């Protein structure tokens, strides 16, 4: 094609069936992989089109794109999708018939193989029965790209450490000609640096990292210990949030996250009695009550659901005007995911964490118990340190003064976000200072 972008748009349309890219960022990433002069790191949430960023460029390349993916279930999802698009995609694994195995190995030995995209477990990629095939592919210069999917699996500080992933670096170096595309949904900066080092990515690494920052979310922290009427404070909070078309009255809905079922039940009643209708949602309820509560919340019959973290996964509601954490979350990640259910329609929403040192001490305690249980059962691990530090970053978020968006950015590894008087601290630095000084005196 006269224009490389025109061929990319063409293939995205003709093969994959999309008129545009989901985001400028997915576009930029895909284009950097096509240009092929840089190793590429892509860190985008599950559903943000990571796959395409290597799958489309794989099709516009001379040769084969090997895609290392950690477990067979994940491979199969994409193989089947790619087969619906009549893409020449193969998978080498031991969940196969020994016949299919040799049919493919033969196809890979051909000068001009049928296979365009080869999905493979890291186990398979390091196994000696595959080494000959790998070598002839390397020798013939028949690899266009090496792709390492679920790249965080290389990090002991990530959530899913796989020793198998430690070997992928040696492999990467052998494929000098083929650029490496490493992808994950979840990487703190420390996991990023492990991905960059442990996979021997060639600097300069092009990074495409979906930021946390949403311009329409107002984050604040309130100290339960500093409030005479906590339930009253929450009620005013929910009402202000829902009362953003004064003429029409209550519009939108909200979520209030609590650690325990007991708390969900009681807090729902306390709010209802104080003039904001609310219902509890938690896994203790019968399946049918959950679907009635969710439904009532979804239909805006009851505007406020008070739930455990068991609520939100399977829900698309775009006019959540507020998420309030009544108890601090297990982790900054949790808090981000939960608070972030607010404001999906882009209109102003409010995320408020109700911090108490008592909650903090209780969650800190329960994290140290469940780590101990794991340390007894499957022995000591560096991920336990990351779990504790995951809580700590949220404790820190509550107990320090600074832009709240900035603190979430620091933790996930985003740039300083354009918080436009969009958090308590940026809107009134002194007010937050006062509350922290005041919380100091409480002990």
């Amino acid at each position, epitope marked *: 094609s006269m224009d490389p972008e025109r061929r990319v748009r063409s293939t995205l349309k003709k093969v994959f069936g999309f008129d545009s890219f989901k985001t400028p960022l997915q576009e*930029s990433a895909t284009m950097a992989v096509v240009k092929g002069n840089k190793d590429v790191f892509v860190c985008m949430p599950t559903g943000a089109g990571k796959s395409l960023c290597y799958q489309l460029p794989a099709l516009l390349a001379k040769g084969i794109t090997i895609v290392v993916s950690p477990l067979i279930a994940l491979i199969q999802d994409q193989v089947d999708h790619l087969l619906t698009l009549k893409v020449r995609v193969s998978s080498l694994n031991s969940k196969l018939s020994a016949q299919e195995r040799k049919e493919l190995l033969a196809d890979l030995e051909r000068e001009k193989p049928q296979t365009k995209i080869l999905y493979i477990t890291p186990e398979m990629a390091a196994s000696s029965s595959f080494q000959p095939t790998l070598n002839s592919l390397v020798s013939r210069h028949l690899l266009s790209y090496l792709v390492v999917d679920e790249a965080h699996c290389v990090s002991q500080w990530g959530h899913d450490f796989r020793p198998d992933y430690l070997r992928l670096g040696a492999l990467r170096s052998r494929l000098g000609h083929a650029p490496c595309v490493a992808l994950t949904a979840t990487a703190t900066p420390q996991v990023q640096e492990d991905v*960059f080092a442990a996979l021997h*990515l060639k600097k300069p*690494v092009a990074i495409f990292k979906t930021p946390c920052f949403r311009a329409n979310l107002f984050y604040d922290v309130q100290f339960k210990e500093l409030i005479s009427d906590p339930y009253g404070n929450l009620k005013d909070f929910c009402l202000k949030a829902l009362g953003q078309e004064a003429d029409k009255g209550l519009s939108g809905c909200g979520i209030v996250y609590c650690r325990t079922r007991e708390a969900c039940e009681q807090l729902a009643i306390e709010l209802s009695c104080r003039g904001v209708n609310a219902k509890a949602y938690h896994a203790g309820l019968k399946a049918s009550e959950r679907t009635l509560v969710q439904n009532d919340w979804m239909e805006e019959k009851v505007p406020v659901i008070v739930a455990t973290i068991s609520f939100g996964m399977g829900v698309d509601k775009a006019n959540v005007r507020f998420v309030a954490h009544w108890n601090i979350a297990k982790s900054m990640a949790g808090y981000y995911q939960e608070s972030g259910r607010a404001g999906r329609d882009g209109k102003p929403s409010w995320c408020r964490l109700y911090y108490s040192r008592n909650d903090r001490d209780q969650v800190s305690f329960l994290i140290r118990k469940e780590v101990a249980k794991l340390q007894e059962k499957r022995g000591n691990k560096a991920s336990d340190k990351a779990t504790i530090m995951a809580f700590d970053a949220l404790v820190t978020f509550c107990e320090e003064l600074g832009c709240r968006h900035a603190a979430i950015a620091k933790y996930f590894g985003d*740039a300083l976000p354009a918080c436009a008087k969009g958090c308590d601290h940026c809107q009134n630095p002194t007010a937050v200072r006062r509350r922290l000084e005041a919380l100091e005196r409480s002990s």
Partner: nanobody
Amino acid sequence: QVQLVENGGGNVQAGGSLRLSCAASGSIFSINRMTWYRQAPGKEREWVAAITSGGSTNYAYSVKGRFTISRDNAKNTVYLQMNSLKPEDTAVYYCEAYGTYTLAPTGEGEYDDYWGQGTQVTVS
């Protein structure tokens, strides 16, 4: 990309001190390691001192006890205090900002190594 500018070079009597600075500018989230190298003309480049983000420091055996590397992350700037200067310390001193993570609010960034032009240290 990143500008690494060195400062604080000079001509100084043996036994005297210098303080070199080294400031990275750009959309810097983090620097894995900042290392001071020195290069006398027609000699092999030499490792002087390093500091990780984390504040772990390491010195060449030749300068241990005489030089201190320090940093101000607020300014992505590392300092090399050089005391008891010897003529053997005469060289061009330069920085490596190794594992430099840059990032725009758009989510587009880089991981790369960056290098200073250097600063002249002569010890009579």
